[PDB]
């Protein structure tokens, strides 16, 4: 299993995946492939747990297989894959179903000489405006192509009319506000200096759109400790002017129309400001800081400017300054295996959710960079980022000497990201099913609108659907995700993703077309949310049962272990989820760590959750065939004492060195002559001019290139220390936290399915 599974697909799907077939199961996430649209949404935008949906609710209940979709609206595409075409229908905007409001797509059935079309989602009959399509041919675009995006491709965009904007008025360009903690803790490590210096260069790479040479995103700057410092950087100043706001609680942040400026025009003053900030706070002794007020100020600033935007916070410590949102050092580890453990993943106060809502109403997305030395209550501090569609980064015990690269890498990528603003997503389906649950980083007021203050190409929204009525095996089950958003240039657009699935009446067709990784992605996210309101033990029980039942049901619908072919890895992956820190934390696992990873997994795509739960293990030494490495099962049992291995879970990279490793290898890789001299915990390989060093360093570069976040490297020597913590990534083995081992987990699952049928 695992190793061979990914290799089977790897050999049976290296050609292009063309999305022209209805419920076609895409290649495995562990397989490299090229996608050619042609009708269905590419798997990079949407992946389902099931590609051949049961036609009725009774049939579905017979299998107990959750029907879910993991959606990534603005997924970043490989260079070779075409981005969505933008269709401009002028003032009338895109044609939509008069009843269910689904947008014109490749599935709409035209009838009666094309004067009308039957809606594929609800079957309502709709008139076709006489100039609807001809309009596309009279804009300054080339018209030689036969196909029209909205009628032939799974994914495309529409320019939106004013009817799709707040106050029936087109939006203005969004803005970025950098908010820096200049308390003693932040200044002493050199973080402030590092950040200010980088910004001098980074602000020139703000997101740009259609050939725009200059970004239209204006910037604002704010520093803070227990008070906030707003800076005026109007282009006609040679020096930045500071306006302090000491009144926290009652706030009040005045205009100061020198806030939010074009980076090119204020280049000199901005540069001066970034030279000043570190100097100005150099001798500070302030240790207490605020948090909520910072987010309130930045958000209020965007509101005053009547534009949406993002706030980038750089925080170092538990906010214990007297002020709205003040927190306590509640990290109580005796609360863990109890009925009140959920309290550690919940925010301390309700001021956060309340503030998150205000942000969403204003199209304000917040990104949080944490650099903690002690408990800082990540769970609570990441509430606004999460409900706002933002991201959270953590650098425990931050130190320039060890984290400059990783942090600068994350920062640069985060600021340069393609991003959407003040957005909303809705998923329409063919009559018979409807979206019933949503998971991810977002906000929901009602039961249908997935509100996204901010959005980028790494975040995913997972949707669960349940039967409403009956589906036809001939009509299939259609899905249409519609994203309404404002771009980095201030343009309002809609992005549509259509995915057509099959409908089946024979249970055997349901079992042949499920996708395990996607199921795991769903199940994991379901469990990770459950931890907020249920004892961990119950959440784990629920997870085990979901899997036990689908397996038992398969047994009675269709002794030895029996599983459909496409679910041969469900058991193994299920054991990995149960053994993750969020559900079975080791003795050294921190509460902030759990909260942090929990938030991360809630927004992960199927690719990330696959490698997060089942890390990739690559043997390095012995087969030096230049170009031609194949991964190994995650077990200490596959670890040879005379070899070296690289392991990655999408967040951390480990280089494991066997104690019996060859001397030449150690020389060529670490530049020391014996295994004993290798530095335990080394986080950067020296640059040595030899084939083995070049190859390993390159491998590290290409692995880092395929993960959204910069993975820290840790060299692990075989005998002592960090060796034990590394054990946790050999997921098929027994863990000290009372993990089971795959084999024993199977035996147990086998008996669990027995108790359901006995
Ligand atoms: Zn309709």
Swiss-Prot record:
The gene is SEC24C. Keywords: Cytoplasm, Cytoplasmic vesicle, Endoplasmic reticulum, ER-Golgi transport, Membrane, Metal-binding, Phosphoprotein, Protein transport, Transport, Zinc. It is found in: Cytoplasmic vesicle, COPII-coated vesicle membrane; Endoplasmic reticulum membrane; Cytoplasm, Cytosol. The keyword Signal does not apply. It is a peripheral membrane protein. This is Protein transport protein Sec24C. Belongs to the SEC23/SEC24 family. SEC24 subfamily. COPII is composed of at least five proteins: the Sec23/24 complex, the Sec13/31 complex and Sar1. Interacts with TMED2 and TMED10. Interacts with GOSR2 (via IxM motif) and STX5 (via IxM motif); recruits GOSR2 and STX5 into COPII-coated vesicles. Interacts with DDHD1. Interacts with STING1; promoting STING1 translocation to the COPII vesicles. One of its GO terms (biological process) is intracellular protein transport. Ubiquitous. The chain holds residues 329 to 1094 of 1094 of the full protein. Zn(2+) binds at residues 97, 100, 119, 122. Gelsolin-like repeats lie at residues 628-698. It comes from the Eukaryota. Component of the coat protein complex II (COPII) which promotes the formation of transport vesicles from the endoplasmic reticulum (ER). The coat has two main functions, the physical deformation of the endoplasmic reticulum membrane into vesicles and the selection of cargo molecules for their transport to the Golgi complex. Plays a central role in cargo selection within the COPII complex and together with SEC24D may have a different specificity compared to SEC24A and SEC24B. May more specifically package GPI-anchored proteins through the cargo receptor TMED10. Residues 97-122 are annotated as: Zinc finger-like. One of its GO terms (cellular component) is endoplasmic reticulum membrane. One of its GO terms (molecular function) is zinc ion binding.
């Amino acid at each position: 299993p695992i190793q061979v599974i990914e290799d089977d697909r790897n050999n049976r799907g290296t050609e292009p995946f063309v999305t022209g077939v209805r419920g076609q199961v895409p290649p495995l996430v562990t397989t490299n492939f090229l996608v050619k649209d042609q009708g269905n949404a590419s798997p990079r935008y949407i992946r389902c747990t099931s590609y051949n949906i049961p036609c009725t609710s009774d049939m579905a209940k017979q299998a107990q297989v959750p029907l879910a979709a993991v959606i990534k609206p603005l997924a970043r595409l490989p260079p070779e894959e075409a981005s969505p075409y933008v269709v401009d229908h002028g003032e009338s905007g895109p044609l939509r179903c008069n009843r269910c409001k689904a947008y014109m797509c490749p599935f709409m059935q035209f009838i009666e000489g094309g004067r009308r079309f039957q809606c594929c989602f609800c079957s309502c009959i709709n008139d076709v405006p006489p100039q609807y399509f001809q309009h596309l041919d009279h804009t300054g675009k080339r018209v030689d192509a036969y196909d029209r995006p909205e009628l032939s491709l799974g994914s495309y965009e529409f320019l939106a009319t004013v009817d799709y904007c707040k106050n029936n008025k087109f939006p203005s360009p969004p803005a970025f506000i950098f908010m820096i903690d200049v308390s003693y803790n932040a200044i002493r490590t050199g973080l402030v200096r590092l950040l200010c210096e980088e910004l001098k260069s980074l602000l020139d790479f703000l997101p740009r759109e259609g050939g725009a040479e200059e970004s239209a995103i204006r910037v604002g700057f704010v520093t803070y400790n227990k008070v906030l410092h707003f800076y005026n950087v109007k282009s006609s100043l040679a020096q930045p002017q500071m306006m302090v706001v000491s009144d926290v609680a009652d706030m009040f942040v005045p205009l100061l129309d020198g806030f939010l400026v074009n980076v090119n025009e204020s280049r000199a003053v901005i540069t001066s400001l970034l030279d000043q900030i570190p100097e100005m706070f150099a001798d500070t002794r302030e240790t207490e800081t605020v948090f909520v007020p910072v987010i309130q100020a930045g958000m209020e600033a965007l509101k005053a400017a009547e534009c949406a935007g993002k706030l980038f916070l750089f925080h170092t410590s538990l906010p214990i300054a007297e002020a709205p949102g003040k927190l306590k050092n509640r990290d109580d580890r005796k609360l863990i295996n109890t009925d009140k453990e959920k309290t550690l993943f919940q925010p301390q106060t309700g001021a956060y959710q309340t503030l998150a809502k205000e942000c969403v109403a204003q199209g304000c997305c917040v990104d949080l960079f944490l650099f903690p030395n002690q408990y800082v209550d990540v769970a609570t501090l990441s509430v606004v980022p999460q409900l706002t569609g933002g991201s959270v980064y953590k650098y425990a015990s931050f130190q320039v000497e060890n984290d400059q690269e990783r942090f600068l890498s994350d920062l640069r990528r985060d600021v340069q990201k393609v991003v959407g603003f003040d957005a909303v997503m809705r998923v329409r389906t063919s009559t018979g099913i409807r979206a019933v649950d949503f998971f991810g980083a977002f906000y929901m007021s009602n039961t249908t609108d997935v509100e996204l203050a901010g959005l980028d190409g790494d975040k995913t929204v997972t949707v669960e659907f349940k039967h409403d009525d009956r589906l036809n095996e001939e009509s299939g089950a259609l899905l249409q995700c519609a994203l309404l958003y404002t771009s980095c240039a201030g343009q309002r657009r809609l992005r549509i993703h259509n995915l057509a699935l099959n409908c089946c009446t024979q249970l055997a067709d349901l079992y042949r077309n499920c996708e395990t990784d996607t199921l795991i992605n769903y199940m994991a996210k379901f469990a990770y949310r459950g931890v907020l309101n249920s004892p961990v033990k119950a959440v784990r029980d629920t997870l085990i049962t979901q899997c036990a039942q689908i397996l038992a049901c398969y047994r009675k619908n269709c002794g030895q272990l029996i599983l459909p072919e496409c679910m041969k890895l469900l058991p193994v992956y299920l054991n990995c989820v149960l053994k993750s820190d969020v559900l079975q934390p080791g003795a050294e696992v921190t509460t902030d760590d759990r909260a942090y990873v929990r938030q991360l997994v809630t927004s992960m795509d199927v690719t990330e959750t696959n490698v997060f739960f089942y890390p990739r293990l690559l043997p390095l030494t012995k087969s030096p065939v230049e170009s031609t490495p194949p991964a190994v099962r995650a077990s200490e049992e596959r670890l040879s004492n005379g070899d070296i291995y690289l392991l990655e879970n999408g967040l951390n990279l480990f280089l494991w060195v066997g104690a019996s490793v060859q001397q030449g290898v150690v020389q060529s890789l670490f530049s020391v002559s014996s295994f004993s001299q290798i530095t335990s915990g080394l986080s950067v390989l020296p640059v040595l001019d030899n084939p083995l060093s070049k190859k390993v360093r390159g491998l590290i570069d290409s692995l880092r290139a395929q993960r959204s976040r910069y993975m820290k490297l840790t060299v692990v020597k075989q005998e002592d220390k960090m060796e034990m913590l590394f054990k946790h990534f050999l997921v098929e083995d027994k863990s000290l936290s009372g993990g089971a081992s795959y084999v024993d987990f199977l035996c147990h699952m086998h008996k669990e399915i027995r108790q359901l049928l006995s």
